[model samples]
Target: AMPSYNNARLLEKRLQNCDTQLNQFFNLSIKFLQQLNQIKYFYNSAFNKTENEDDGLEVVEEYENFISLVSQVKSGQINADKAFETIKDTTESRQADVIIANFFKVCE
Candidate 1:
């Protein structure tokens, strides 16, 4: 049985809010990407002056993994919650972790 349209307006309003929240999530993700790029650049530049080639490579690999997760979220291939979990697992920066967690909470 189908529900009546009597409360459809309320549902529509909530759906609009959901859409807004999703857009906000993407916007925050874009900001996170910028911050992540800056962090990668800082590490790459710092490591270039040192002999820790392995450490530099590890940073690059982790950056790539985070990028992949962001791409998946953008493409709707994965949800934000799953992305948050993956980020939490691989991330070492406490600030970036907090940013991602805040993004998830706002979306919720």
Candidate 2:
């Protein structure tokens, strides 16, 4: 499900109850990254025409690298469902106090 929640409380509840699927977050992150890449291209074309070629080249290359990393997070490039189970494991491994404080911070 390409799910989204307008309310943080609901999002938190779902996540805490193991109802928030990893694929939903992964897909949203991928779509967000693609939109960012499009916006970068727009700005480059609109405002970068007079910029120095050297700097523009570097920025373009760096942006592509950021997008590549986003893609990695998006696809997992393997078994995302299994691989992403690590998120819960790591979260649970945290000190109890820290885990309590941070559990639903990602809801928004």
Candidate 3:
């Protein structure tokens, strides 16, 4: 009983800290989402500019996938925090990828 009370007190003291951390996580997600959109805009703009040129402009599927994930969040198809949670849960044992996997680590 004494041990449980001490644990409860510790948890109660940390509740605000947890809330602050989650809020920071959500805000960072939003910042990353904005940066993703900016990059996507420039990516498409570059492609569009080169579309009429003779020099080749190739479409990369990986970039498209990255942008697609960001678009899903921007379009409200997925909540950022929920997406973060999904990534956290699903990637528990996963190898690091080239993109948001590291971002997840930083957010974590």
Candidate 4:
């Protein structure tokens, strides 16, 4: 499977693009998680309940965003696999990752 000169160059460009997307995606994913936690805290303060109904809903959306970013990072915007393994490569093994794994595991 030898690539033509042009084809090889294109492939290299694509790989570089994927790397850039990966960097952006990881930063956004972390921000999303941090926002999720912050939103929950704000919701608690406003409602005077440790939990807010909308907080659960917002968390759902954040989970979707994280998975979307994961896909972008792994496949560079391709509709590839579930990209679960790529996501496991996240920088930290915090409660955030656990919550994210549950996002994939549990569904409607």
Candidate 5:
């Protein structure tokens, strides 16, 4: 038997909702990453006077990785989901962790 028109319309609505949600999610992800950059800038300034060379270097490197991820997403080389996962897996700073946690709450 053929599927009913109502079922087809319901599926179409569901697909449209999913599309809208994905678009919103990606938009928020980019904004979140930009805010992270701002946070990282202030973080660097706050810690710049400290004398721990190794820690400073590691933090800078992490931010560089984050910047690269941003560029990739911006250029369409990678999707937001991949960029988020890359940062999530590589992030070590407490500030970054807190920001990511907040981002999760916002997305939900």
Candidate 6:
């Protein structure tokens, strides 16, 4: 049946009801990805424009330089996710860079 969440937790509850429908679960995941993509875009535009103290007031240009991030966290993308974390924890020089990248990568 077509569904709608009555409250915040209702969405998760709805997914639970589809336990037998593996495909539906995957579809819901895709829908979640779309929502997350919008959030990520909004985040990047707002944050990237401002120069924060941690970066010593450095303005970021990630907005025009990269592609849109439509990251979805799911069982299927686990390894890719880890590799991203590994790079962030290991090679990145600044928290700002790592965080900015992460915001985009979440939807990657």
What stretches of model 3 exceed 4 Å from their correct place?
1-28, 51-56, 59-108
lDDT of candidate 5 over 1-108, digit per residue (tens): 012323333333433343343344356357766754555544355334434544444544554555555556656777767677777756666677667445434333
Model 1: which ten-residue window has the lowest total lDDT?
A: 1-10
Query: Could you estimate the TM-score for every candidate?
Result: 0.48, 0.31, 0.27, 0.27, 0.47, 0.24
Clash pairs for candidate 1: none
Off by over 4 Å in 1: 1-51, 100-108
Model 5: lDDT equals 0.50
Provide the global lDDT of candidate 1 against the true structure.
0.52
lDDT of 6: 0.36
Model 6 residue 17 lDDT? 35
Those runs of model 5 whose alpha carbons end farther than 4 Å from true positions after fitting are 1-37, 42-50, 92-95, 98-108
- Kindly list the per-residue Cα lDDT of model 4 for residues 2-92, writing each as its tens digit: 2332334333343334435434544536655565454343322322321443533343344344545555535455333354454567525
Clash count (model 3, backbone only): 0
Could you tell me how far off, in angstroms, the CA of residue 93 lies in candidate 1 after the best superposition? 2.8
Which residue pairs in candidate 3 have backbone atoms (N, alpha carbon, C) closer than 3 angstroms, thus clashing?
none
**What ranking of all candidate models by lDDT puts the best one first?**
1, 5, 4, 3, 6, 2
Report the lDDT tens digits of candidate 6 across residue range 1-108.
122223323333332332223223235366555544543444334443444332211212222222212122333444435545533553344754555455444434
Score each candidate by Cα lDDT.
Answer: 0.52, 0.36, 0.40, 0.42, 0.50, 0.36
RMSD score of candidate 2 (Å):
17.5
Best by lDDT: 1
Error of 4 at 1 (Å): 50
Candidate 2, 31-85: lDDT as tens digits: 5445444434442442244244444444345334333333445555534333334
Segments of candidate 2 deviating more than 4 angstroms:
1-50, 77-108
Ranking by TM-score: 1, 5, 2, 3, 4, 6
Q: After superposition, how far is residue 53 of candidate 6 from its true place, in Å?
A: 11
Candidate 1, residue 78: how far the Cα is off, in Å: 0.9
* Predicted candidate 3 versus true structure: per-residue lDDT over 1-108, tens digit per residue: 112322333333333343343334356357776644444444344333443222111323323444445445655676556545544543333432323544433332
Clashing pairs in 2: none
